[PDB]
Amino acid sequence: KQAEHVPPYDVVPSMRPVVLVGPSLKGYEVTDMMQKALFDFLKHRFDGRISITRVTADLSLAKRSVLNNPGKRTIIERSSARSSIAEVQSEIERIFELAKSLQLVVLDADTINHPAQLAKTSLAPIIVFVKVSSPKVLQRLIRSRGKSQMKHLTVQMMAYDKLVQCPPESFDVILDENQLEDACEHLAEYLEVYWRATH
Amino acid sequence: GSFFMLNLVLGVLSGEFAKERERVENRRAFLKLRRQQQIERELNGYLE
Numbered sequence: 104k105q106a107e108h109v110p111p112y113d114v115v116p117s118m119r120p121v122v123l124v125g126p127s128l129k130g131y132e133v134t135d136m137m138q139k140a141l142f143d144f145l146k147h148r149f150d151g152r153i154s155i156t157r158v159t160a161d162l163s164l165a166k167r168s169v170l171n172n173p174g175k176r177t178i179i180e181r182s183s184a185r186s187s188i189a190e191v192q193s194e195i196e197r198i199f200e201l202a203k204s205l206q207l208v209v210l211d212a213d214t215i216n217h218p219a220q221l222a223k224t225s226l227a228p229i230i231v232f233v234k235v236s237s238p239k240v241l242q243r244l245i246r247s248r249g250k251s252q253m254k255h256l257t258v259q260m261m262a263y264d265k266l267v268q269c270p271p272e273s274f275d276v277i278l279d280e281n282q283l284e285d286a287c288e289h290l291a292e293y294l295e296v297y298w299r300a301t302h
Numbered sequence: 303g304s305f306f307m308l309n310l311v312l313g314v315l316s317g318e319f320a321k322e323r324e325r326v327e328n329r330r331a332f333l334k335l336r337r338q339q340q341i342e343r344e345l346n347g348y349l350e
Contacts, residue, residue, distance in 0.1 A: 240344050247349065281347035 113225055116202030120228040121209040125266050126235045127259040129213040132248050137233055144287045145209055154201065158212035160190045165224035198226060216262055218273050233278045
């Protein structure tokens with residue numbers, strides 16, 4: 104039964120990373136601001152006890168059992184030696200060592216649009232969903248930005264509906280309140296519970 | 303002739319209005335009016 108051999112124990116990061124997903128594609132105005140506001144609130148409320156860094160590199164390929172060492176050297180000039188996978192793994196150990204520091208970590212990587220893309224990995228981050236009540240409100244919001252977002256409104260709606268079709272048990276916390284404050288104290292209370300629980 | 307008649311007219315008209323207010327064609331418009339108000343209430347906080 105060694106075809107897969109799923110290990111009973113996995114070495115997850117000491118502190119579960121906090122990641123925001125939704126309500127649309129990362130890299131578009133609505134999502135960037137909707138997440139930026141929460142990031143600023145988290146930084147200000149937990150000042151001196153939280154570290155937030157943007158993860159430019161990709162993260163969806165956090166594998167453990169692909170091979171002994173895919174691309175051990177960069178001078179091999181191989182398919183993976185010239186690739187950027189090693190950057191992904193290096194970011195993996197960077198996240199692991201930062202979670203080792205016992206301080207809270209929040210990720211700003213723009214390559215997450217569904218928790219299913221980061222559910223089979225070793226990190227298992229705290230998925231935070233900032234959902235919008237209805238599609239009309241989201242598309243009205245998008246219209247409030249300008250024509251630049253009107254151009255990508257189609258893909259924004261598509262990703263929004265696909266991410267809503269994801270079931271609630273997939274996520275860890277939900278932020279469905281239309282008020283920024285209420286969601287802020289909701290996330291703050293959850294992270295306060297986590298902080299008091301791990302001390 | 304005045305107070306009783308006016309009371310009867312007032313009651314019959316109020317009953318007619320109450321019965322008419324719950325027809326499908328008016329209830330369907332009231333639901334639309336409520337839904338648009340609810341959408342706007344959420345959109346205000348989201349622009350905030």
